[PDB]
Amino acid sequence: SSTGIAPKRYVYYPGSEELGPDEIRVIACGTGMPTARRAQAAAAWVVELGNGDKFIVDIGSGSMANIQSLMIPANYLTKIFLTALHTDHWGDLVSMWAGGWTAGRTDPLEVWGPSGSREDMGTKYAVEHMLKAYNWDYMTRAVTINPRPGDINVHEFDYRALNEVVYQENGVTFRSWPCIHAGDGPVSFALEWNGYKVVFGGDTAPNIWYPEYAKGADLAIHECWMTSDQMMTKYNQPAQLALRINLDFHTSAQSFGQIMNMVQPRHAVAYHFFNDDDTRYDIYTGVRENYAGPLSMATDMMVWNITRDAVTERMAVSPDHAWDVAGPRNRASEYTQYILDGRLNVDEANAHWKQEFMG
Amino acid sequence: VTSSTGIAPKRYVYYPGSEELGPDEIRVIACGTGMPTARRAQAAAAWVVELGNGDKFIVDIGSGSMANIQSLMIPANYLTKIFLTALHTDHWGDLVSMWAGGWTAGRTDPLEVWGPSGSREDMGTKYAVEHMLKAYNWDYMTRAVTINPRPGDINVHEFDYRALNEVVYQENGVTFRSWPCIHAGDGPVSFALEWNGYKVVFGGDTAPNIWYPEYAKGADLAIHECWMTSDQMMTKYNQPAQLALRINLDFHTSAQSFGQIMNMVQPRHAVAYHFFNDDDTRYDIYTGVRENYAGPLSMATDMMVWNITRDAVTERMAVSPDHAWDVAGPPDRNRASEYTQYILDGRLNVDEANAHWKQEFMG
Amino acid sequence: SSTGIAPKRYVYYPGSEELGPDEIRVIACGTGMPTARRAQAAAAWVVELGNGDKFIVDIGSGSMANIQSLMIPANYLTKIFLTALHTDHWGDLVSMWAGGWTAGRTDPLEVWGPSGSREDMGTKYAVEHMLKAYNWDYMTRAVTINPRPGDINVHEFDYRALNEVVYQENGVTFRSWPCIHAGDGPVSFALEWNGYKVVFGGDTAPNIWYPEYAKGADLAIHECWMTSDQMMTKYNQPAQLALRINLDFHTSAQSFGQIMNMVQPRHAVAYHFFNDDDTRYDIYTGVRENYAGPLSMATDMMVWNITRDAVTERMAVSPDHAWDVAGPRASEYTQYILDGRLNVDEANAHWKQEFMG
Amino acid sequence: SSTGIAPKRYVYYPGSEELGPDEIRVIACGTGMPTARRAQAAAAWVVELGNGDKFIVDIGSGSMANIQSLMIPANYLTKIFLTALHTDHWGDLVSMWAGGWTAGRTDPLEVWGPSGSREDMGTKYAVEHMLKAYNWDYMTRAVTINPRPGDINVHEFDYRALNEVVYQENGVTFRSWPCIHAGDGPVSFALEWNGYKVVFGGDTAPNIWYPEYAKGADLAIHECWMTSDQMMTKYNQPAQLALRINLDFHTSAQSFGQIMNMVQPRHAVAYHFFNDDDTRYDIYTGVRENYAGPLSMATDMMVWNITRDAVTERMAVSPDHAWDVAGPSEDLAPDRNRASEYTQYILDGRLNVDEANAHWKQEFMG
Ligand SMILES: [Zn+2]
Ligand SMILES: [Zn+2]
Ligand SMILES: [Zn+2]
Ligand SMILES: [Zn+2]
């Protein structure tokens, strides 16, 4: 213990802990809202299974900085599930795509996401057009880097389907069911592996599906909205609009509690509120009106270890100065000679360091 | 601090929202200074420019930069004009976050985006933005049901990437000019903002080129890519020696090249960015610049701020809220619902669970 | 609003806001425990009144970094009140003393603190021996800088006194009353000024005095201990020792609620617990069992604005890279030491030329 | 592997890494100035040797938050060496003393420091009067916790002695030599163990002793002052006083260069400056005028691993929300011989809280 490693550490240092064969690790890489802030990236979850499979559920704007702090090689993070096509649920897919490829991902991204009520409201269309949006980046990068990693294979599934299997691979099952939020399309996921069940709610008004299909989850994640008082205080909403937000549009803390009392998970996770010194306590208290079981109030870099005997909540202590960590056909140039003729002579300036570096 | 009860003047840090901008002043905040690889210390390239006439502009809005921009306490409606140097993810990735975020938070005007063409339609900004709006069609259509759709538009102003120091923007005595960069493939540009005797230059991404030294000449603030050392490229990224040497000569502007460029420009103040600014990277990069450039220099990091006045170009750090909220500034019900009855029929009765707080709140 | 200042800002930027003549600002500069943490300095409060007076109540180990982030000239913070002589309540007095002096505090520090049951248990004895403890620092610094600011004038008051005035100047009154904690000496304070009453509880097991003398405070601060469950989980304590800690030694969250139910303050402040993602919630719940009124769960750099109409909680956003801000004898060397100098003219010659021109 | 630990990590996670039997780890738990700042605690160094020994060299105001972030049990950090009796070099000794003792530390603290030109300018007096300063804390704590860990045993050494052994145990040698700062007493240390030599400069204007006794250290830590231009911009100082600060009083970046040129250490560490985005660069340029060897510009939580083949600089990434971590410890009972420090006058004031605490109290006993 003098020279040796401190065991069972009270914080999670990403890349410092072996994952056991009968264990799951879940890390919140975004817990926040459609509005950006350094304290909270938009919705993103990393799941690491003891079998060695790793999934991303949601990759909202700003979450890539949290994901990259985990010291996980890009080739282990190629399978992404989207609950919804909000920018705060998949905005950083383009950063995973582009950054991973420049940083040695060799395999394409695999993306599972819902359909909508028509083609242009679904995940296939969305990813297809994101790729065209970044055509300049794709074509220029593809000149100097083999484009195989630049492909995104989309597995779109019917948003309407009630607890149907959307993924079955290597003893891992993902089921989806609908959400009620903004318009048709958003879903929740249940990940089933090795007698474990992890539920990723996504975004919804309270629904009849989640309480049924999430039942007995080892870890149950659901949206848990800021209070009507907080909507008045913070967003300057009139009393009636603030009231409606927690009845019509979203799952209230009180509703979240009803739902988790119905679900009886080993551990419930509230997320998708601004987790501030002046907001969290009314939200936690709303939940405890109706649910008394183990509860985590999520913020960025919270981590859950799921074992047979426990679901433990810790905070990740991860590097702000993050770096990519290493894992184990002719194309047309996109330059004209008009541009390449612009090169400045810098032979003189670079001479000293160049002679020293080659020696 | 002249009084116990009163405001400390000329504060050594910049608190966003706490300072009046003078009529002959420019404020520039680095909202991202980093790389195509994400990290909490450094968002990807983003700049906020505030002029004394009340005009504000974003130059680049790379992945991760929106949290920094939101920490500035500037109403969404004042940040509608966005200039892109390149169509890399790490230069316009967070354009979508600004578009959706500000629209939810009460922006009332459409976004306005100036970006370069490419060699053909599908390599320029008009095509890029059109397809980004299609990519987020679900979010657009669902949000347009409950929020007026007008601020969900993006007006694109595409300009010729080939043009040598020509105007791309002219409004209210503010000029932006572009000239080309040499980077990845045709399209990327540098910008010069001219207003009220001032010239601010946003370099973007380039191998050393003949245009910047001429067109950036005498800028109040000159920003230019300044790459990590070949030795770092080896130490960090385990690059095989020759690759590491070619990166700092052919692909990017080395610190030494940046020095030559800024010695030619003779700016009032020069800014190196686009490297990982760490306790074991920054010093050799600095030394590299000083080989050739002796003038005023900032080694940019996130939330660094420059005040440009007639007498000085000041560098300070911004001290800004991590727990940021949108700040308020000064609905077409003839839209088809994007719900079907099938999904609406799924609602859980939660009347009991919510009655307690619901009674109380209606007092 | 484009060119202009953002009004009524949602965070407090220290040095950015004028205090009105009927306003109080209280900043928690330390909310923690006798064990150190970058997240929570030990007990320290800065109070700013609209009449321009400023006070420090407690200055525990680690709090000086928070106090220095406030951009307050050292000469404005010369008056310090100590609730108790725990290192986690006055450990940073020496940092304020030495730091302020080198940074151009011109006036001596003034310290109000309790006596104990005998001379060697009181503030007078403590500060006299603190200055001897740092006599090398004192003597060497005094050679180069005038020693007036290096004086500490101690105002020891009787710990036993029941709600008596220990300070009265410029319309500001502090009263003390005793606490029940560790041993005889610890006290709570009440600052009264311009119809406002701010209570600094210090450290206590629940006592009959605080509920009486704190009644109707604008801001009531009281110890609010971590739970007997948190005591076993975090300190591997035996169940019965973990039970006693929250009944005999300290104020339980539940006791805190009872006390604040009795006090009926405009705003209650719970502090002196580790404010963590897995501790804070049970502490809040315990309080809410008995207290329903406005409550803050304190952490470092929380700030309250006390006005006629409101008591507001905000977080302060302050510089980590802090600098002192300007407000408006025989050598201790022997020749044997001054002889050891290394010549460095050559090495320093280049810059010495540039600088002088 | 997807399942395994990432090896040779680019940041140090305190408590995550086994220390090699022929390895030294040095952590800057404080690198700053007489004035306080969240970014930089005052001068403090933690040194872990492969043999299991650990030492603290300096424990300035603010450093204890950093030291506690290391997940080291209190019982392993009972040996402290002071280079000077400045508040910003030993201010947090008291925090260590009180906090460890409450945390469950069972060994007294052991303090090594310099004498001065007379009794009341040396460490023995300083620590004696520090214990008297905290007499209320001592006597109240000694009622409920065993008093033996509350002792501080002082080993005062002669400040004038040129490179003499002030500590010698378990194959570890500490030597001291003088410095030229503020007045007589402040020293530098050299820690020698298993063919390694680590030097803690302390504070000094440039001296003849450092370059001689520091020669060929694996890690050489020396004061390296902010620039005279920086003294003018920051502290509004006049030109001549600004100039004098870097010549008369402190080691300029340029002098630091000369000294490390002369010492030729494996790795040089510059510290004791405010490490800001607008100060660090000129200070680095200053050192490079005369020193070309491996250099760290120190800031808080910077860590050096010293091995036969390399000296590696990493940043430690450590918990802000720190907790004491348990290690080996005695279950020493409180001394019932000790008088209570309560009088019946104070005890008579207890409020009845039976009711408010009965709900959670019952449930807790179930
Ligand atoms: Zn959402
Ligand atoms: Zn770039
Ligand atoms: Zn206390
Ligand atoms: Zn010092």
Residue numbers in the entry:
A (entry chain E): 8 to 335, 343 to 373
B (entry chain F): 6 to 335, 341 to 373
C (entry chain H): 8 to 335, 345 to 373
D (entry chain G): 8 to 373
What does the paper say about this structure?
PNGM-1 has both MBL and tRNase Z activities and is considered to be the evolutionary origin of B3 MBLs. The zinc ion in the first MBS (Zn1) is coordinated by the residues His91, His93, His188, and Asp210; the zinc ion in the second MBS (Zn2), by Asp95, His96, His279, and Asp210.
No electron density was observed for the zinc ion at Zn1 in the variant H91A. From a structural viewpoint, the substitution of His91 and His96 by alanine markedly weakens the metal binding affinity for Zn1 and Zn2, respectively, compared to that of the wild-type and the remaining variants. In H96A, even though electron density exists for the zinc ion at Zn2, the density is weak and noisy, implying weak binding of the metal ion. Both H91 and H96 are located deep in the catalytic pocket of PNGM-1; thus, the substitution of a bulky His residue to a sterically smaller Ala residue could lower the overall stability of the MBS, in addition to the loss of one metal coordination. In the structures of all PNGM-1 variants, except in that of H96A, the electron density corresponding to the catalytic water remains despite the complete or partial loss of a zinc ion. Each MBS of PNGM-1 is formed by four metal-coordinating residues, and the substitution of only one of these residues dramatically reduces the metal binding affinity of the enzyme.
